[PDB]
């Protein structure tokens, strides 16, 4: 048993809910929250910016030190950093950004990072301003992730469309 509440079950291991991932993380304090990051860990806007804002910029400070030491991530790659006040850990995962012309085939590689963690709270990768089709992102998630994933869908209308179109 875990502390996630109000999720709809999509498969054996994937759950979904219309929720603000920031508000969800604050309530659950999951072991792992997934940040939909970029390779520079520049949390300007979106989920990245919203999680970073909720940490009072401590996520960005930690991320800048990580990049100064290690250099940028790969598209499709990840790193584990602190969860600050939101979670034990934050798994920063880089999905391809369609609005920058990155290969959508890298989405599967991005989701494979989730398999290193038994339970995660996550947004849909490569959605919103990354320009991928969220329906596709959910299909890749279900077909790639084998560990238990709790997906927070912010957009109400999108949530309803993801559920009603899910095969
Ligand atoms: C990766 N990513 C996912 C989302 C989540 C979309 C949603 O749950 O509605 C998002 C929103 C704004 C900017 C980037 C975003």
From Swiss-Prot:
It comes from Severe acute respiratory syndrome coronavirus 2 (2019-nCoV). Residues 1-167 form the Macro domain. It catalyses: Thiol-dependent hydrolysis of ester, thioester, amide, peptide and isopeptide bonds formed by the C-terminal Gly of ubiquitin (a 76-residue protein attached to proteins as an intracellular targeting signal). Responsible for the cleavages located at the N-terminus of the replicase polyprotein. Participates together with nsp4 in the assembly of virally-induced cytoplasmic double-membrane vesicles necessary for viral replication. Antagonizes innate immune induction of type I interferon by blocking the phosphorylation, dimerization and subsequent nuclear translocation of host IRF3. Also prevents host NF-kappa-B signaling. In addition, PL-PRO possesses a deubiquitinating/deISGylating activity and processes both 'Lys-48'- and 'Lys-63'-linked polyubiquitin chains from cellular substrates. Signal peptide: none annotated. This is Papain-like protease nsp3. It is found in: Host endoplasmic reticulum membrane. May form homohexamers. Interacts with N protein.
